[PDB]
Amino acid sequence: YEKNPMNMSIEIPEAFNMLPAQPKDLHFKVPCTSKCTGLTIYRPMTIVLITGV
Amino acid sequence: YEKNPMNMSIEIPEAFNMLPAQPKDLHFKVPCTSKCTGLTIYRPMTIVLITGV
């Protein structure tokens, strides 16, 4: 393929972050979350696949 | 009936109020509470109910 933002891209609407720690008895639980979308091909004439290799 | 605080009354010793939210993994819970007593009739001879109207 050819690497170019106008051919394909990956979107990250929000970045990795950590919520405030939640205390339980003498310890804490910290949850983390993020967002993603996958791979989007705007122009499908710039990629070639070779399967069965 | 005859409307008079001496005959019947309702008490509300505590009004509606909310508590701070209690977080969980990825959501919250908010509780609400209040107090009441219901109608108290000190002198019940000052009320007449006509039934079947």
Two structure tokens written together for B38: 């219901």
Residue with tokens 């003498």: A26
Chain A residue numbers touching B24 (CB-CB < 8 A): 22
CB contact A31 to B (< 8 Å): yes
CB contact under 8 A, A22 and B26: no
Which residues are within 8 A (CB) of B35 and not within 5 positions of it... i.e. 6 or more apart? B12, B13, B14
CB contact A40 to B (< 8 Å): no
Which residues are within 8 A (CB) of A7 and not within 5 positions of it... i.e. 6 or more apart? A1, A41, A42, A43, A46
- Distance of CA A41 to CAs A16, A35, A48, B38, Å? 24, 19, 12, 67
- Searching chain A, which residue's CA lies closest to the CA of residue B22? A22
Among B15, B18, B8, residue whose Cα is nearest residue B36: B15
Query: What experiment produced this structure?
Result: cryo-EM
Among A36, A53, A39, A46, residue whose Cα is nearest residue A4: A46
C-alpha span between B27 and B23 (Å, rounded): 6
Residue with tokens 């170019």: A4
Q: How many CB pairs under 8 A join A and B?
A: 8
Give how far B25 is from chain A: nearest CA, Å.
7
DSSP state of B45: G
Interruptions in chain B after residues (C–N over 2.5 Å): none
Q: What is the resolution of this structure in A?
A: 3.1
Two structure tokens written together for B26: 């990825």
